[model samples]
Target: KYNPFRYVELFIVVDQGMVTKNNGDLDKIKARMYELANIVNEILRYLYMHAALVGLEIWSNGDKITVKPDVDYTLNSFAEWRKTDLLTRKKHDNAQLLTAIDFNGPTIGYAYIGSMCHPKRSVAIVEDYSPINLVVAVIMAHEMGHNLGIHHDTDFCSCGDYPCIMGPTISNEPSKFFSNCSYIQCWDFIMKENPQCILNEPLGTDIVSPPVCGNELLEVGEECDCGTPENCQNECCDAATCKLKSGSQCGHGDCCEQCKFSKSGTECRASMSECDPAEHCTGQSSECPADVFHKNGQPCLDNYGYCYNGNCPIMYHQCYALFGADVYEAEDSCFKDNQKGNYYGYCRKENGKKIPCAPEDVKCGRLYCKDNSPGQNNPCKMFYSNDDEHKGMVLPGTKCADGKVCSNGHCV
Candidate 1:
């Protein structure tokens, strides 16, 4: 059972950035873009999985959607544009003028790829404290809806009118859970485009719905409601809404305070245990952490508890010095022996080995996965042993990677 409708080319442009507007440092912002791109791929991967279930495969001579980095755009500037980025993307898909991408625009970033396309989006968009992680699958569900051709409702907007995904928290439009509208436009386009593809479901149920099960691993951000946390994976939901628990992004931390709930887009709030700005106990947080951090306004590492003055007072944090080469700024070339910036696209070996795997096959640290991620001009997203081949490469500071304990001078 394979279904792949290939008509047009999906080009993810990795044009460098020149527009820093008035935000923070360029490198820092760029790194965030790299992370964001990886996250957004989550949406793309979701589509691939579903398409396969309906008899579509990437090899169907179907047109492939690809990403290409340009010279001028800054690393942080690219993740290109999503259909819902501004109030305008919905009405105007410039890609149509350029005559590319199926539905609207292509999302082009590694972290963003993972964030928007991942089976569960929490690994990318997380705040240690809020239960947002719990509903990650739901958010993925919403994005999948979009990827599959669904859009938010025209009549209802926000969680109050419809449910979460289709509800318009960001766009003030009716939310969609499974793929909807223009996606259907793309869907029909795909089904018609791929010659060997079949739109019908397989004779078996697994091939049809395939029960959207995860590895059954929930991270720090969830609050399992109906079932045990381990079994609390996402199930099938119609275009209507999912049966899982849903909630607004809540908490009164620094990032939260900076974001307007209406247009916060996405922000994390790991915890504010030592923060209570009003009582002078913590920052202006409404809640405290299960465990209090040492400094009130300081940030923490995924492993360590608290950080003091951008320095890790506790081990396991970004600053704890788990290795020898942990520096953030690029002192030298991050790529190895005369290679271009980390060139980890897909490749294949003599055996059935696939190098530079196709999009769905690539994951977070693999060469085919993280190379050329957003902000990162082409550096290895994941670290490998004996990486000295990539010598002279100056890496950004430790905090650039997620779930990583920054080594002496790089994310590796």
Candidate 2:
């Protein structure tokens, strides 16, 4: 089925560079952003994923942060701004910044890999370098792919005649399809990580759209919309008019089965992890209630981690995410290197410089792991070089010491 199992409520921010490129026309900038988002959503549909534009902002007044030629600096600035400002005003699974500013190198985008549900890291920065919206959309999609945990397509990852969307370099013509490796990696990430934020259906108010009958989304006036008439197979919904059939109680959502609402107290949404809480059907509505979970700071992961944003951020699990299943966290001795504040070990980056970890915060700094997988030569370095730099750092909310957890690179 073409129905996407996962939906990303994307919040887009257009920087001053992009605004200037459109001659400071707000309408033109908005239209272009919508067009780019539509193209990106279509591309992601191939992977059974949907990207919904939840919010869009065009920097009409001026750039919020310095629009530098350096990719890292620009991406960092945007991420910080999103965390501190934009996110406070809006709700979204991920955020991206579109900029017309050219970077210093060949890189057109920068994003932290597998950061979809991270409160601080679920953001990307894409350079709108091409004249055509499709080209820029492809770049944005590529960066989004990284945020979705898809790595660059290697030589072994085949795409037949077309270049894969996750390829290191984009060709003159970019393929909308993801390669086999990308498909595997993306699914693996989704299944293992279970990014709870993206699991919830986007609220009607959050979707940036007018009520449309055949758009599949149950909009303000529609009883139920199951997509185009040609593709919809819901017996309870009339695709043409987007209304429930006669005698039908409902036509959509987890609580609706066989066109009727399930009994109240029926388990509609089961908890996927220890940190999550299962939700029950209310019987009055066709939709499941909003997901809930253990409050932040609740002990979880067998006390190895704290529940934060509905996730138990354990260091060992993070190591597995980076170096595969056979990897395990290294001894505490190795984490002591974080005090050096170098490339290999640091608590955090400040003003483009790595901050040395305090003695108490060493365990909350760079994460070191030992790979037990067979037939591997210098596995640590191999994994470190191939993945994003942030992947090696201990994630925020991870348990750092007894009765303490990592928060913003500090043990507290």
Candidate 3:
């Protein structure tokens, strides 16, 4: 069976610069934000992904954090605010900050590469620099692509007409499509990382603005909607009217096939990991049941980790993900270095202070690994760091010792 389409429920934050640009008219600001989101969704649809605007907050009162030409400062401030504030109010797979401030250097947007589903790094900051909405939308899409693990396209990748969405530099004419390289890399990331947050369908209530016909969402008044006429592919749906065709009971969803609902008990979502369970169809509805998973603290991944919020985050898996399959965890004794309370080893930083790991929580601190891949001129004795502060840190929920797991940088 084909893989289910992934949905990224985006929470967008518009800064004061955008508000000032729109003359402080919230309605106009919202409409423009939605327009940009729609363009991003259209571009991402080619990858079997949908970017849905679940929440939009206009900083009409003032900028919540500093918005300046410093891309790093802006991104870090937004990321911190999202983790500490926005996340508590909205349930979203990713968050983006749209600013009218033109950043310093050639950077139009900045985001952590392959940070999807990360607790503190899934957010991106994009500058709405171009007067053309399409150009700005393409930049936003490119930043979001980085979060999804799609690297900048190389010369080997081909895009017939214009520069691909993953191109290192945007051209005058930017193509809506991703190159072959991006497609493969995105799928590889999904297969390896299993970013569980985006796997489920977004709730209708989470979407911002009134539902519109031809937007692909099955709104209150619409029987079915498969998007605009040019992009609609569902034979059962009348894209022009957002209605089902004659004799068609359904036009979308994994549980709907041949324009009819699947039989009850039919598996619509197969289990993807040790902590997840399959979801079945109800026969009466076109959609599948909400995804469920094993309870937290449940042992999984051969006891390498405990299931937490439907994921088994293991230290070895993190190492492999960071340094390739040949990398493995370092000797247990190496974990002692975490007691030093410095960049080389520590539990976590608080207000620029590195907190040393407790004696019993050594394994829950910074992760140490050795690369075993042959033919490498300079193999890292320790784990590789791409200038990322959290590069070698053990992820939350990673097993630290027998019957114990790391939670908030502590063994719990």
TM per candidate: 0.21, 0.68, 0.74
How many clashing pairs in candidate 1? 100
Ten-residue segment with the worst summed lDDT in candidate 3?
Answer: 377-386
Q: What digit string (tens of lDDT, one per residue) describes model 3 on residues 301-349?
A: 7667788777788877877887777777777788888888866788877
lDDT of 2 at 127: 85
Off by over 4 Å in 1: 1-18, 22-26, 43-186, 195-412
Cα TM-score of candidate 2: 0.68
Alpha carbon lDDT at 377, candidate 2: 40
Clashing pairs in 2: none
For model 2, how does the per-residue alpha-carbon lDDT over 1-412 read when each residue is reduced to its tens digit?
Answer: 1235788889998888878777889987777777787778767866777778889888889678997888888887888888888888887889998887788887788998899977778999998878888888998899999999999988789878888899878899886788989888998999888787876666556677445576555557777877778878878888987778788888877778879887778877767678888778777867788889888888876678788877788878888887777678777777888888777788888866889999889888788787655676443331344345776788888987778989888999
Model 1, position 30, has a per-residue lDDT of 35
User: What lDDT would candidate 3 get against the real structure?
Assistant: 0.81
lDDT of 1 by residue, 1-412 (tens): 1224221111122111212221324444334333322232233332442221211111112222232333112212222332323212221111111111222223211132212221222111111111232233334334334433445555633233345443443332323333344344435534543322223222222221222223121112222111233433333211122223344333222232322122222323233333322222233342332333355224554443323323442321211122223322221222232122133322222233323333322221122112333465533333334432222222222233334322332233
Best by TM-score: 3
Could you list the CA RMSD of all candidates, in the order they appear? 21.4, 6.5, 5.3
